[PDB]
Ligand binder design. Structure first.
Ligand SMILES: NC(=O)C[C@H](N)C(=O)O
Ligand SMILES: NC(=O)C[C@H](N)C(=O)O
Ligand SMILES: [Ca+2]
Ligand SMILES: [Ca+2]
Lengths: 241, 241
């Protein structure tokens, strides 16, 4: 179809635009925050076990203001130095079982985690994680919490034909941004069944309607951006003009 | 008329692309470094007079790889702690008389200097400046040197349909990037007389020839981007098609 090849072309335009939106906001924020976390981690290995030192550094204003929260968890006694004014570890918190820590211990360098549920705010976030060494003795790890607010803002700022929207998922298809926020945390197949997670153009039927869907990857985070429109409506709009 | 207006239109399209490019490379990167330089400074205020701590921080890898060079010069003393492996202050060097020191002590907060000639590398650079405070008094200022290589990258990557080119100057009219590097350091009026440093379209005559020039500002640096073409060449190229 020629009107249909135009629908697809337009969906592609918005999708590419949304991919550039993500890279220019979140992705460049992370790259900047990564430099901050890496250097903070290096400065702390000047004297890693000095908790007094560690706390002073994490409470310095700009650093404290660039992240949701920052902390250091120690391998020896599972304690936590952190800068979150309103949160304290409850007796059951073990830094070493948290994903920022596991990843950092495994990869042995700066790491960005997959999205996960924050214990402090119960929001879905990501963290920068770093290993801490004392002469190549691994003595603990750090988290630098980044919130995902900007994705929610991008995903609510765009309309497709008033008959479609964009959404964002992880590499395993867990939704992390969606105009209807109930769907976050869900695999996308819960609201968009019979769709594969892959680049390309897919066409489906759902509850008596016909939808066009296209995905694109954001390789650095391994996220997917989905665009989905009602194809009957979009056809009506393009033929009418 | 029509062909002249199109020339103006094309030159404008390239000027705007160059503005967007400048904000998306060096400006973003600057924002990033400002964050880094601000946290490095606040952490050094944990122990401003401790010279050995200052040195082990500035020699930390990620930080020392983020800037051309970094240093700290003391008010009372004019002594300098720095991480340049290719420079050491001679008997004449007084940090307190350098532009980065001066601006920082003036503004009492983080600053970005105007383009100036680096005492070490002799190239034209900018520095971030930050004041250093201990228990509410000035004990010195810091520098974070940033190269301007990206500007050269930008102006050497485009060529206004082989009839002219783009160039960049400070707010005072000093060329900091030009496809022909020997103009750098000179006022732009030396190669392009009778052109005012203001936004808008100008037409001049110079040594028999006719030139079109558009300037645009990048407000947060107060730099000007200039786009110039030989208007007779541009005419031959556009009327053809
Ligand atoms: N403050 C924290 O909760 C640290 C980290 N975000 C975690 O959930 O384990
Ligand atoms: N000391 C330095 O090299 C910093 C700066 N380039 C200056 O000329 O003062
Ligand atoms: Ca706390
Ligand atoms: Ca030196």
């Amino acid at each position: 179809g020629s009107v249909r090849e135009e629908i697809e072309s337009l969906v592609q335009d918005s999708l590419m635009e949304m991919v550039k939106g993500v890279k220019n906001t979140i992705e460049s924020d992370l790259a900047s925050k990564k430099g901050l976390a890496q250097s903070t981690t290096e400065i702390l290995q000047l004297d890693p076990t000095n908790k007094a030192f560690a706390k002073s550094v994490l409470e310095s204003p700009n650093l404290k203001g660039s992240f949701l929260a920052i902390g250091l968890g120690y391998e020896s006694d599972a304690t936590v130095v952190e800068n979150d004014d309103g949160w304290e570890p409850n007796a059951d918190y073990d830094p070493r079982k948290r994903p920022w820590y596991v990843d950092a211990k495994r990869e042995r360098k700066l790491v960005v985690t997959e999205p996960y549920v924050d214990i402090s705010t119960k929001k879905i976030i990501i963290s920068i994680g770093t290993p801490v060494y004392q002469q190549s003795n691994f003595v603990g790890a750090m988290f630098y919490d980044v919130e995902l607010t900007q994705l929610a803002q991008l995903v609510n700022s765009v309309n497709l034909f008033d008959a479609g929207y964009l959404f964002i998922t992880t590499k395993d298809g867990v939704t992390i941004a969606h105009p209807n926020a109930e769907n976050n945390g869900e695999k996308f197949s819960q609201f968009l069944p019979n769709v594969d997670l892959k680049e390309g153009t897919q066409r489906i039927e759902l509850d008596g309607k016909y939808y066009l869907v296209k995905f694109a990857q954001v390789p650095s985070e391994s996220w997917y951006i989905g665009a989905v429109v009602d194809e009957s409506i979009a056809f009506a709009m393009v033929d009418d003009l």
